[PDB]
From Swiss-Prot:
Species name: Homo sapiens (Human)
Name by which UniProt lists this protein: Aldo-keto reductase family 1 member B1
The protein's Enzyme Commission number: 1.1.1.21, 1.1.1.300, 1.1.1.372, 1.1.1.54
Description of activity control: Cys-297 may regulate the kinetic and inhibition properties of the enzyme, but does not participate in catalysis. Tolrestat inhibits retinal reduction.
Tissues with expression: Highly expressed in embryonic epithelial cells (EUE) in response to osmotic stress.
C-alpha cells in the first residue's frame, strides 16, 4: 500500500485529490476519506481550500482517529512564489492553513515561474502570463532549505518534462534529488516515455487526473470521456468493479501513486476499494493502447513561457 521514496520515507500509493473540491464540502470529504482508510491527501495553495482541508486533518488528529506519522500530506509551491526569498513564506502559509508543523512532501507545482503579486496568473495587457526571471535551479535550492529547516520531509516537482527533470538532476551542487514528479496520467495520456525516465532515476511518479477530470471547467460535451469509454467499462465489468476503480488500479500497477478527487462520500469510499483485485498484463497493455496524447491540464496563457513544459515530446 506504500512505495519507498528516495528520502527513506514511505508514501501511500492512493491519495485524495482536492483541486475543485468546494470549501464547503472538502472538510467532510477529507474526514470521510480518513475514516475509510485514506492516509495521503494532495493539496495546493492555489486550490484555495487548504484551510478547510486542514480543519478535517486536525479534527481527525485531535480525535485520535489517525496519528500524524501515519498521514502523508502533500502540498505545492505556486508559480508566483518561485523567487528564492518567497519560498519559505509560501510553505509556512500552507503549513498554517493545513494546521501542520511539517509536510510529508512539497512540490514545485509547475516549472513556470510567474511574477510575484496577489494574482495567481499575472497577465500582460494582451493576456500572456508574466514570467519570473528566477532560474528553476535557484527555486530548487530554496526547496532544499525547507528540508534542512524541518518544514518538509521531502521535496519534488510537478509537470516537469524530461529535460526539466534532467536539469534538476544535473544541478551544480544538488543536495536533494526530487522524490516525486507529479504529472497528468491516464489511459488517454499514458506518459510511457516520461514515466520510464523518472523511474530509472529513482523518482516516484504520481498520476493526477486519473479519471480524466470530468469536472474540469473547460470540459466540452464532445470531449473524450474515460468514465464513459465502453472499452474500459468492459474491463471493469469483467472484474466486477466500477470503471473508476479500474482507472485507479491501472496506475497502481505501473508502480505509480494515484490521487483521484472526490467530494462525494460514496465515491470516496468506492475509490479506495482497489486493493482486492488485479488487472491482467493483457488488461494493462490494452489500457495503455488507448493513449491519444489527450491532455486536460495546459493553459494557452502559458504556451510562450520559456519553461512551458508541453512543447517537448516528453
Ligand atoms: N499537479 C498538478 O498540476 C495537478 C493538476 C491536476 C490535478 N492535480 C491533483 O490531482 C487530483 C485529481 O485530478 P482531478 O481533480 O483533475 O480529476 P479526477 O480525480 O480525474 O476526477 C475528479 C472527478 O471525477 C469524479 N469522480 C470521482 N470519483 C468518481 C467515481 N468513483 N465515479 C464517478 N465519478 C467520480 C469527481 O466527482 P465528485 O467530486 O463530484 O464525486 C470529479 O468530478 C486533483 O484534485 C489534484 O489534487 C494536480
Ligand atoms: O495546477 C493544478 O494543480 C490544477 C489544475 C490546472 C489545470 C490546467 C492548467 C494548469 C496550469 C497551471 C499553471 C501553468 C500551466 N501551464 O503552464 O500550462 C497550467 C493547472
Amino acid at each position: 500500500s506504500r512505495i519507498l521514496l528516495n528520502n527513506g520515507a514511505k508514501m501511500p500509493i492512493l491519495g485524495l485529490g482536492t483541486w475543485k473540491s468546494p470549501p464547503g464540502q472538502v472538510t467532510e470529504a477529507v474526514k470521510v476519506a480518513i475514516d475509510v482508510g485514506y492516509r495521503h491527501i494532495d493539496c495546493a495553495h492555489v486550490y484555495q481550500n487548504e484551510n478547510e482541508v486542514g480543519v478535517a486533518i486536525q479534527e481527525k488528529l485531535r480525535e485520535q482517529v489517525v496519528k500524524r506519522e501515519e498521514l502523508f500530506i502533500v502540498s505545492k509551491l505556486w508559480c508566483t512564489y518561485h523567487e528564492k526569498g518567497l519560498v519559505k513564506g509560501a510553505c509556512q502559509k500552507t503549513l498554517s492553513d493545513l494546521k501542520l508543523d511539517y509536510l510529508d512532501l512539497y512540490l514545485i507545482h509547475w516549472p513556470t515561474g510567474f511574477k510575484p503579486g496577489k494574482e495567481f496568473f499575472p497577465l500582460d495587457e494582451s493576456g500572456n502570463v508574466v514570467p519570473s526571471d528566477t532560474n528553476i535551479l535557484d527555486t530548487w535550492a530554496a526547496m532544499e532549505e525547507l528540508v534542512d529547516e524541518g518544514l518538509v520531509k521531502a521535496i519534488g516537482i510537478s509537470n516537469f518534462n524530461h529535460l526539466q527533470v534532467e536539469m534538476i538532476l544535473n544541478k551544480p551542487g544538488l543536495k536533494y534529488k526530487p522524490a516525486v514528479n507529479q504529472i497528468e496520467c491516464h489511459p488517454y495520456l499514458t506518459q510511457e516515455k516520461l514515466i520510464q525516465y523518472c523511474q530509472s532515476k529513482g523518482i516516484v511518479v504520481t498520476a493526477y487526473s486519473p479519471l480524466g477530470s470530468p469536472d474540469r471547467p473547460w470540459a466540452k460535451p464532445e470531449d473524450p470521456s474515460l468514465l464513459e469509454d465502453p472499452r474500459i467499462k468492459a474491463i471493469a465489468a469483467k472484474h466486477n468493479k466500477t470503471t473508476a476503480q479500474v482507472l485507479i488500479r491501472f496506475p497502481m500497477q505501473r508502480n505509480l501513486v494515484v490521487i483521484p478527487k472526490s467530494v462525494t462520500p460514496e465515491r470516496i469510499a468506492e475509490n479506495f476499494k482497489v486493493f482486492d483485485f488485479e488487472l491482467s498484463s493483457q488488461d494493462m497493455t490494452t489500457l495503455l493502447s488507448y493513449n491519444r496524447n489527450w491532455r486536460v491540464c495546459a493553459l494557452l496563457s502559458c504556451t510562450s513561457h520559456k519553461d512551458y513544459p508541453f512543447h517537448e515530446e516528453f
